[PDB]
Design a protein around this ligand. Structure first.
Ligand code: ZN
Ligand code: ZN
Lengths: 60, 116
């Protein structure tokens, strides 16, 4: 996805493609209360003291 | 012990209690209908000042499949003996003073719950 997006502008690739591909998702304030949000993808998932290990989403 | 509502047989309405003065027994009459039935519990009302409610009776087995709930491996289940298990406080208002956890097994077809 990153490679296909970095070559945008030139061809035709945009955010709608990411949304349709199933990588991002719109979570509203009422649903955000029932998801294990994560701050960064790398730091908060490697392998350490078992905090939750059940992250569902991750912020940009 | 507690007392539950028992509806009528014909009109299906609330049955109020009645102390039979003739036979000296407890009856449940109907406001509208004239139905009668001999009682068996010998109780009418009970009040729980301390409100000693067992939180385990409110907890459900579906809590296990919660993505935003902690899990521990040091408190395995009893019946099935699975390792993974969840834990959480009462999560109910009017908590007197206790953060005692309520461990629930995290595995299908078990739904067991316990406390330590
Ligand atoms: Zn009746
Ligand atoms: Zn179990």
């Amino acid at each position: 996805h990153i490679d296909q997006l970095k070559e945008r502008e030139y061809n035709n690739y945009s955010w709608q493609d990411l949304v349709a591909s199933g990588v991002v998702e719109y979570i509203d304030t009422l649903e955000e209360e029932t998801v294990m949000l994560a701050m960064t993808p790398d730091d908060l998932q490697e392998k350490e003291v078992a905090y939750c290990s059940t992250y569902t989403h991750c912020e940009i | 012990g507690f007392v539950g509502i028992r509806f009528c047989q014909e009109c299906n309405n609330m049955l109020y209690p009645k102390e039979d003065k003739e036979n000296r027994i407890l009856l449940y009459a109907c406001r509208n209908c004239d139905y009668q039935q001999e009682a068996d519990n010998s109780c009418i009302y009970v009040n729980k000042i301390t409100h000693e409610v067992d939180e385990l009776t409110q907890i459900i087995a579906d809590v296990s499949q919660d993505p935003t709930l902690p899990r521990t491996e040091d408190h395995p289940c009893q019946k099935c003996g699975h390792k993974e298990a969840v834990f959480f406080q009462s999560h109910s208002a009017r908590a007197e003073d206790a953060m005692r956890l309520y461990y629930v097994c995290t595995a299908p077809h078990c739904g067991h719950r316990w406390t330590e």
